[model samples]
Target: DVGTVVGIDLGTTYSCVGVFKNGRVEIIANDQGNRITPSYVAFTPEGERLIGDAAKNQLTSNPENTVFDAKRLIGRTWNDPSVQQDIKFLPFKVVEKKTKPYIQVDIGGGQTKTFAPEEISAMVLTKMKETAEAYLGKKVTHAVVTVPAYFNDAQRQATKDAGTIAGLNVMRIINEPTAAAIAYGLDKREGEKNILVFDLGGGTFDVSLLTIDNGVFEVVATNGDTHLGGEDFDQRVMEHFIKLYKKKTGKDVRKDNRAVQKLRREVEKAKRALSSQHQARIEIESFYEGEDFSETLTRAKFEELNMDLFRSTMKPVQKVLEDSDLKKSDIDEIVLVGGSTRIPKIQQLVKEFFNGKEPSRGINPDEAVAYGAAVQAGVLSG
Candidate 1:
């Protein structure tokens, strides 16, 4: 049975909900049957909002209206450099009101609407809540939400506020990496384990080294870049397309939001395709200025273009190894979670970094956090 207490992986690029009952955890899918839903919200000029897959699907038609990375802006003030970066890249406007940043969106239709970051997040959480109820065929009240371990107090509070605005009792706000640790340690509680969790999800990257002892999860060290993750990989792909299309047609795709948005999704597909194969084909007819765009992307070219981005993930991995006060060889298992870590090169990088030992894929990459959160939910109820 889907219990009243649920666990939410309120991820940046994607999100999921799960429940622990009958001594087992089961992740619940949305009404659309996706175990993980995109963390996207499309806001209309008339103040109407659409969330998740609908908004993600709407990105091609309404790129400006579709906002995907609200997590980057949810907890910070308008003055933060990260927020400035969000403003710089996002098609929507980030404005200052009441000394904090609010997203102001105008699509040349109806009256413009402005929203606080948390409000937008709440809308997504509300969707998750509704989906959970719909899945279990009943109602749910309490939840344990997970956040990036690197999130500051403000960020965590912002997440809790999202749950509140969605009308749920936010039982606990826990660290994503720690939650993953909990999930991995649950089946191995009889012995001590030194684990490293590398969470490269859609919108953010997190790495943590922890020790597990008889169910005690302790984070000995953690490091990550909030702005770095699979979405960054998507941006790298987006930039590649824009640059190539510009060189071929002398038209920059960035100027046309729809062109960039649609092509971004196309290249994301190409990115996933490149994971298993050496080459992936990109075909977009009349993509920009009524012109067709066709190209074959080689994995080598993709890696070379984003080598620095790939290397950036390693710096923190190295930092965690250094800070954990343990030798790299001492690591018993490297638990991999988040969709981004599924990339072949990322797994390869971590594997080579740890002396040819393969990362433990014992748990589902997408559901590990939610599973741990459900375990915590179970603990809370007991």
Candidate 2:
């Protein structure tokens, strides 16, 4: 290899970095030994900037200055209706940057800092970059970044620009599902196969139909909603819990950001637990501005509250199959990607849609994109 290169997945709520070494892909953990980092950024009262988990730690204590879920705003204009929908869930302020939306945060000293969505994304990528380089004991000047399958040219280009700002060469941009397919099929048995890459990440959704033949891969059709994923599921759980809390205790948790933030964290954990367990218990002491709340959340209720969201993803899957002129039975393999795909409901949905056939397993959903990216980096280096 002439130059050191790595793969990066700068996801909406979390991000990761991976490198291809010793003829295999390896995930590079952060300084804290975590493979993935929260995609949150913030500033302290003393003017120190924080990213990842450090920023997430400040979320409940300093909601006004913490920037989170910035990927949904990247490359999107304020005129887009999606912005109108997303701006409501966000705790911080979003101002127009001529053509696109950017967030405003106080960096202390009576001064505030404005960052474009791309710049905020860059912070996460920079951390990933440093983590990878420190692990390799060499500089990584080249990178392959992953984006959602349905991301438009503007959005894809913004991701490339983020890599540039993060001090990477920005070699190539690949689709999330496509990248997952690469990792899943890279060492498979030699044959022709039609596969579905059902990628449900932290902040985006994509389902792509691809063909693998004799080691070559091609996307036959792809479709998805850029603004749907685990975050929406978490929000639904939070909303229901808050409603139940108010109904019983007459307390409006939404009135306070700290309460909402705490609930947000709890709901995410509950959502994860519900994926593996039929029921998950959510409890918070003195929740919502000094009010206590406790509830046991069932998977049935979780699925019910988020059925529309799940159905929304199915529409794209149907569209992609239609676009490819193929029936569900024609797919030889169903490959799951993204952390959100761990839900039992999602697994059952795919199994049912394909008439009881099971999706492939063993791939690390969180690091699949980065692994594929690293594989592509190896190819580029050669």
Candidate 3:
């Protein structure tokens, strides 16, 4: 019997799985026909469970019970500065009881559930393993997983632990940006090239400077703001809605999760629409406190609200360029990664930073990391 090799991109916001077959990389879709799965999970009141989109949908309604951002906690300790800061910002309660880090979430119906970050991540990895197994029609015991290049040894070990919990025979852990470079270089295998990967995902943001020489991908430098991304964008939208609510009615709806969640969903939809249109409109209905309200947003207005975030990304981009001792023109190509990079303003900012050179496209920004992992699986097996 022939065994199948799988590549997994276990990301903070989404997860993707793929495999190499017949000399090409192919992404495996889930039952819903979606290539990427939301990295969110929740437990039901009856002791059952849910994962991905279904779980993420309940976040606003049941903020206390839903577990998001396990990727941010992975391989981190209670004493780490980043971990300490994240604990306060997370929606659910994070506590160290019995010397173990755990998250306690309220999943509605007056019930609460607790889980470790490793456990939550394991659930996602398990789903990806199942998806690959179904596509291959064989047990997928071996696989390659990708992580952030700046992840410390402890974090890398936690990723390996996640694979073990999911019953996958651990092969190797590739850096997320490096995997991206491999995917791009494999497609454009003409000569030596310098590439910058601008990866901004749900919970973390990373910028990698690299050089691909004859199939060997080397990282020159990396910089990022781990706490930044689409989530911050949502926060900005939520803040604006709060002000609108105060002006329309004499109530502070900012304290209401339902109101915040509703606004966030609409804001996210409008944000996505801005990628293709000059303006996107959002409707903010009053479902939280029996009041009716609506709002419309333009792309320009949205960009203005997020100007600070755009500026935040620029500093890292400049830092990476300086560390690499390369100018904007020295780069041969700029590859955009992560779901958040789909924003039109972000694309324009990248082009302008690179002195008007448009970045390459066609690779799914959301799925490229996993596809690259599949390519790496093929190389390792060969």
Candidate 4:
């Protein structure tokens, strides 16, 4: 037997798992046959627990009980400035317990309960654990988890606590960029290489400069904003349409949770569509007070609406290079490691930053981190 060991990438928007077996790494699929699972949990009216896709499906109907994006709250206090800003976007209630932020969820029968951020993350981790078990047909007990390179001691410890709560002995806490580099097969490449990992995920961004030599990976510099991500880009479109909806129908959909949730869902779809096409049309039937809303979003408009945010991403790109004492010409491979990097504009900007050199696309943006983590699991088990 290979062993009941796995590597998990518990991300802000989605979570994924993989196992090493038969001399290769297999990214395990969830019960839904999905390679990646949404990091969401919901409590139904019967007080039953729902997770992953099931949880996401009920988001509009049970917005207050559906908790997504808990990763941002992990290891953070209620007084955190970022947490305060995050409050507006979340439909679920976030309360303070012992100075730390906690999620308050309604469990039906006129009852409610509060769970720590670690517990919320543990639920997502458990889903990943179960996913691996379903695929391997055995209980998984050991794992290596990846986190952002800039995560502090508290954030790292919180992630471990979440793993422990999910019943896994976390063998290691690896930096996401480092894990991506490993998945890129750079360790097997000849000569020393200086690489940059641009990780722009659903809710956070990280840029890291590393050197791989003799199978050893060394991080020279890292910089990122914990609050910036693809979701922010989505938010820009959401806000733009919300205002337009009001102007068209004199109805503020923001005042209606269901309407807002419905719009959010369509906005995400449109945002994704724009990535592959020149434009995408967002249509919502009976969007607000029985009024329909439709709008077309073009790629140019998306880049225009989010230009400042996209431009801000370059600050970290410049910062990481300068901090590492390496010029753009000196850095070798520019690896893309997050789902957000799929955006054409983001790719164009990265290419331009690297002086027309294309970013490496050898690895799946969503799976690279988990793939690297699985490779580490194999190494540690052996």
Spell out the clash pairs found in candidate 1. none
| Model 2, runs deviating above 4 Å | 1-3, 73-102, 186-192, 288-291, 379-382
Please write out the lDDT profile of model 4 over residues 276-324, one tens digit for every residue.
9998988899888887878899989988999889878889989999888
Roughly what TM-score does model 2 have, to 2 decimal places?
0.87
Q: What is the lDDT of candidate 2?
A: 0.83
**Candidate 4's error at 299, in angstroms?**
2.3
Regions more than 4 Å wrong, model 1 = 1-3, 21-23, 60-65, 77-90, 95-99, 105-114, 186-188, 246-255, 379-382
Displacement of the residue 239 alpha carbon in candidate 2, Å:
2.4
lDDT for position 203 in model 2: 81
Specify the poorest-scoring 10-residue window by lDDT in model 4: 1-10
Deviating ranges (above 4 Å) for candidate 3: 97-100, 104-114, 186-192, 284-288, 380-382
Off by over 4 Å in 4: 76-99
Clashing pairs in 3: 64-106, 65-105, 65-106
Q: TM-score of the candidate numbered 1?
A: 0.87
RMSD of 3: 2.6
